Structure formats: structure tokens, C-alpha cells
């Protein structure tokens, strides 16, 4: 039953991701009872909202560096570590995933997590900025673009993808199946058993197609448009790794968190 699979994935999606697209849209449109997020659009507004950014380390976020760009870098990788953990929890709820070889589960996560991260960033973005710290804050696109090189080049391609991706008007029920399709990619490098992975993605793709026809009966070929976004995410990853390598070659004290180092090591 493809509808039962869709509902199962949505239920797991709700359990794994605290800030859904529905909750993010209510915040971005101001149609919610809670107070507005703190807006970070320049150096002064960052200093006033910096201690509200979730960041648990040896010293506070404001003490990470004298440079604003480096403090943004540190706060963002703290979020990324927790994002990987949320996606891992959701991946384990995909029927058949935990029955795969553990080394293949690792491989699917290693290559899938950042593609999922950039997919779900779009849920937290409008054309002018992105929600941070579980919707508590809002960091503008112009501010992220004003950071010195190469820091100012990181977020802009994610905003560009999000503008086009959000035009598809997917909801959380659509996205739950779509991210499962991405995780169960049989062409990841180093996979040991491709066949059982492709068998799962086949059902996920059928469930996705039925979900889009029911939830978007006016969007003809929405399935075809969405499948083309799966390859866009791989280009974003490729561009992202190159920027991280500029950091590794030209910046000093900067070092990725251990979980992120493990993901990027021997990636492609």
C-alpha cells in the first residue's frame, strides 16, 4: 500500500524534525502567536542576537573569533551536526533501511545527509533570508552575502536553489517521501548491495508519484520537475566541498567538527 507508506514516512518526519515546513511558513508569514524572530542583518544586529543562536561549546559563540564571518561559520557547523543527527533518525524509520548492510547504511548517510540538508533549508528560506535556531532567529540573505570571501559564497547558491525549489510548493507530506527517495540512492560510491537499495527506492518513487498526483492534481509533471532537483543537490554539494577546501587551505584555526570531518573524508 503506497498511501500507508506515505503516512508512515510523514509520521516519522514529524517525529524527527522539530521545525517542519508548515511551522516555518507560519513564522515566515508572521501568522503565529509567538513573537517575531530576532533579525540578523548587519554586524550590530548579529551582536544583539548572537547569544540566542544555539551553540554549546567550551566558550560562548561571541568568543569564537573577533571576525564575524568565523563566528557565523562556527554557529552553522554546530547546527549541521544536529541536522545530521535528525536526518539519521529519520533514515532509520524508512522501511527496510536498518535491514541493509550497516556499511551501506553508513554510505547512504555519508552521501545523502547534505543533499537532505539543502533540501530542507529551502523550507526555512524566503527570497530574503533563512530561519535559524529552530525558528527563533532570521538571518538575511544580504547579510550572509556581505561576508568576506569565501564566507560570503556559501549560502547564496542555497538561496538560489531554494527560490526555484519553493516554487514547486511542496508540503511536509511531499518532502517526507522525497527525502527518503534521495537517501535510498543506489548509485552512491562504494555501495556493497545495490539491488535491495534500488528495490526500496522503487517503492518510494511510486509512493512519491501517487502523493504528488493526489496532493497536486493541477501540477502536471510535478514528479518530473522534482526528480530533476535531485541532480541539482549533487551540484550544490560539489560546489560546497570546494568552498570548504578553500577554508582548509587558507584559514588557520578553523577546523570542522568530528562528525562533519568523518562525512567529508573520502567523499567522492
Amino acid at each position: 500500500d503506497l498511501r500507508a507508506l506515505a503516512k508512515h514516512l510523514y509520521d516519522s518526519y514529524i517525529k524527527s524534525f522539530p521545525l517542519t515546513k508548515a511551522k516555518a511558513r507560519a513564522i515566515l508569514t508572521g501568522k503565529t502567536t509567538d513573537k517575531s524572530p530576532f533579525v540578523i542583518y548587519d554586524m550590530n544586529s548579529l551582536m544583539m542576537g548572537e547569544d540566542k543562536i544555539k551553540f554549546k561549546h567550551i566558550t560562548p559563540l561571541q568568543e569564537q573569533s573577533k571576525e564575524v564571518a568565523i563566528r557565523i561559520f562556527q554557529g552553522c557547523q554546530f547546527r549541521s551536526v544536529e541536522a545530521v543527527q535528525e536526518i539519521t533518525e529519520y533514515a532509520k524509520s524508512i522501511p527496510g533501511f536498518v535491514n541493509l548492510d550497516l556499511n551501506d547504511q553508513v554510505t547512504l548517510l555519508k552521501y545523502g545527509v547534505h543533499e537532505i540538508i539543502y533540501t530542507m533549508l529551502a523550507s526555512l528560506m524566503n527570497k530574503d533570508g533563512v530561519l535559524i535556531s529552530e525558528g527563533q532567529g532570521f538571518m538575511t540573505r544580504e547579510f550572509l552575502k556581505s561576508l568576506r570571501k569565501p564566507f560570503g559564497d556559501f549560502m547564496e547558491p542555497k538561496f538560489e536553489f531554494a527560490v526555484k525549489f519553493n516554487a514547486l510548493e511542496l508540503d511536509d507530506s511531499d518532502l517526507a517521501i522525497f527525502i527518503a527517495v534521495i537517501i535510498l540512492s543506489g548509485d552512491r560510491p562504494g555501495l556493497l548491495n545495490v539491488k535491495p537499495i534500488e528495490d526500496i527506492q522503487d517503492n518510494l518513487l511510486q509512493a512519491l508519484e501517487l502523493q504528488l498526483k493526489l496532493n497536486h492534481p493541477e501540477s502536471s509533471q510535478l514528479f518530473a520537475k522534482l526528480l530533476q532537483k535531485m541532480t541539482d543537490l549533487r551540484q550544490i554539494v560539489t560546489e560546497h566541498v570546494q568552498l570548504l577546501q578553500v577554508i582548509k587551505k587558507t584559514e588557520t584555526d578553523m577546523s570542522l567538527y568530528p562528525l562533519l570531518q568523518e562525512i567529508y573524508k573520502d567523499l567522492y
Binding site: 539519521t88 550497516l102 547504511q105 568530528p258
Partner: peptide
């Protein structure tokens, strides 16, 4: 010492 394995086995 894989951190990804630790998250997967939890």
C-alpha cells in the same frame, strides 16, 4: 571509531 555507525546503532 565511526560516529555514523554510533548514530545508526542507537
Amino acid at each position: 571509531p565511526s560516529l555514523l555507525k554510533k548514530l545508526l546503532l542507537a
